[PDB]
Curated annotation (Swiss-Prot):
Effect of residue 280 to A/I/V: Strongly reduced the catalytic activity
Site annotation Transition state stabilizer: residues: 208
Residues noted as binding Fe(2+) in the record, renumbered to the chain: 211, 213, 267
Catalytic activity, reaction form: N-[(5S)-5-amino-5-carboxypentanoyl]-L-cysteinyl-D-valine + O2 = isopenicillin N + 2 H2O
Organism the protein comes from: Emericella nidulans (strain FGSC A4 / ATCC 38163 / CBS 112.46 / NRRL 194 / M139)
Occurrences of domain Fe2OG dioxygenase (ranges): 173-285
Listed EC numbers: 1.21.3.1
Cofactor: Fe(2+)
Gene name for this UniProt entry: ipnA
Record bears the keyword Acetylation: no
Subunit architecture: Monomer.
Protein name as it appears in the record: Isopenicillin N synthase
Record pathway: Antibiotic biosynthesis; penicillin G biosynthesis; penicillin G from L-alpha-aminoadipate and L-cysteine and L-valine: step 2/3
Localization per Swiss-Prot or TrEMBL: Cytoplasm, Cytosol
Effect ascribed to mutating residue 220 to I/V: Strongly reduced the catalytic activity
Length: 328
C-alpha cells in the first residue's frame, strides 16, 4: 500500500489581508483538491491539545446511566426528537466505536427553525454540569473556534475556484448553520470484537467502509494514529497522521456545485487496535442555502446541474449514509 500525497498548507494568510498571499494559499488548495482531495491545514491557531484533553476526560468519565440519558433515538425509543444530537452508544462485544454529536449552540427553543420543527434542526443535549464540569463550556467554545477556521478555509476554496472570497462563506452563518461536531472514541479492546471489524473487497480490515462525506467540506482533528485511506484509480493509499494539523477534504455538496471539478474523495477507516480520537467538524450551510452549480472547466462556467437546497441534500445524505454504512 502506497502513501497519499497530502500536503501541509499554512492557512494563516486566510485570516489576514495580504491578498496575494491568500491567492498563493488558494492555489495550494486547488492543487490538493484536484489530486488526492486531502490536505492538512497548519498554522490554524486552534488549541488542539486542550481539545483532545477535554474530549478524553469526557469519554473516559461518562457512565452507562448518562449514556442512556443522552442517547439518540436509535438507542433510546424515548428520545424521538434526537436523530442527530446526543450520544451514540457502543455495544460491548459487537460495536466498538462510540461518539457524542452536537449542533449549532444557537439552536434553542426560541429559534424559529426549532419552533417550526424543521428537519435536521435539534436542540443540543448535554451531560450534567456537576458530573462533567466545564465540558459544555469547552464544547460550545470549540464549535465557534472551528467555525472560525472553517470560514477562513471557505474563503480559500472560493478563491481557488475563481470566485470572490465570500462565495461560500456568505451562506455559512452562526444563526443557521447545520454544521456538527462529532467527538468519536475508537477504543483499545482486548480481545477486539470481530463483529466490529469489516473486511474490504481488497482484504483490508476496516472500522468504517468507503464513503463520500455528507458536507461542503470536512474539518477533522485526529490523534496521532494512522487509520485513513483515500481511494485513487490505482487503489487505496494511506493518509499519514498528524496530530497538530487539521485534515481537510470536500464533501459531496462541493462535488455537486463544481460539476465534479472538486470531487468528494472516497475514503475509509482501517481497523487499528489503539485508543484514539476522531473529532470531525462537518461544514454544512443553512437549511435553505442554495448555490447555483457552475463548471470551472467551461469558459462561461455554465452547468446544467440543478441547484440543490442544502437542507434537502443533508436530510437525504445522512439517511443514505446510515443505510449504506450502518448506524454509527
Ligand atoms: C469519521 N467518520 C464519520 O464521522 C462518518 C463518516 S465521515 N460520518 C458520519 O457518521 C456522519 C455524522 C453526521 C452527524 N451525526 C450529523 O448529524 O451531522 C470516523 O473517524 O469514523
Ligand atoms: Fe468521512
Amino acid at each position: 500500500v502506497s502513501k497519499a500525497n497530502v500536503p501541509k498548507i499554512d492557512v494563516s494568510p486566510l485570516f489576514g489581508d495580504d491578498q496575494a498571499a491568500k491567492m498563493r494559499v488558494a492555489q495550494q488548495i486547488d492543487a490538493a483538491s484536484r489530486d488526492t482531495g486531502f490536505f492538512y491545514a497548519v498554522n490554524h491557531g486552534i488549541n488542539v491539545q486542550r481539545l483532545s484533553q477535554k474530549t478524553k476526560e469526557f469519554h473516559m468519565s461518562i457512565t452507562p446511566e448518562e449514556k442512556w440519558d443522552l442517547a439518540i433515538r436509535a438507542y433510546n425509543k424515548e428520545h424521538q426528537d434526537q436523530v442527530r444530537a446526543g450520544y451514540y452508544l457502543s455495544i460491548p462485544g459487537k460495536k466498538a466505536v462510540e461518539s457524542f454529536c452536537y449542533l449549532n449552540p444557537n439552536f434553542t427553543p426560541d429559534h424559529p427553525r426549532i419552533q417550526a420543527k424543521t428537519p435536521t434542526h435539534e436542540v443540543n443535549v448535554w451531560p450534567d454540569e456537576t458530573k462533567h464540569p466545564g465540558f459544555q463550556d469547552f464544547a460550545e467554545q470549540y464549535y465557534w473556534d472551528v467555525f472560525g477556521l472553517s470560514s477562513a478555509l471557505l474563503k480559500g476554496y472560493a478563491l481557488a475556484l475563481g470566485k470572490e472570497e465570500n462565495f461560500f462563506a456568505r451562506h455559512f452563518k452562526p444563526d443557521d448553520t447545520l454544521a456538527s461536531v462529532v467527538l468519536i472514541r475508537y477504543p483499545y479492546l482486548d480481545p477486539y470484537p470481530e463483529a466490529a471489524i469489516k473486511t474490504a473487497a481488497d482484504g483490508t480490515k476496516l472500522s468504517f467502509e468507503w464513503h463520500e462525506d455528507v458536507s461542503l467540506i470536512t474539518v477533522l482533528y485526529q490523534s496521532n494514529v494512522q487509520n485513513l485511506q483515500v481511494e485513487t484509480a490505482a487503489g487505496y493509499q494511506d493518509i499519514e497522521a498528524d496530530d497538530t494539523g487539521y485534515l481537510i477534504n470536500c464533501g459531496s455538496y462541493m462535488a455537486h456545485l463544481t460539476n465534479n471539478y472538486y470531487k468528494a474523495p472516497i475514503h475509509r477507516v482501517k481497523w487499528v487496535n489503539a485508543e484514539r480520537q476522531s473529532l470531525p467538524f462537518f461544514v454544512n450551510l443553512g437549511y435553505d442555502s442554495v448555490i447555483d452549480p457552475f463548471d470551472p472547466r467551461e469558459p462561461n462556467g455554465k452547468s446544467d446541474r440543478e441547484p440543490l437546497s442544502y437542507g434537502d441534500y443533508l436530510q437525504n445524505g445522512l439517511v443514505s449514509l446510515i443505510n449504506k454504512n450502518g448506524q454509527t
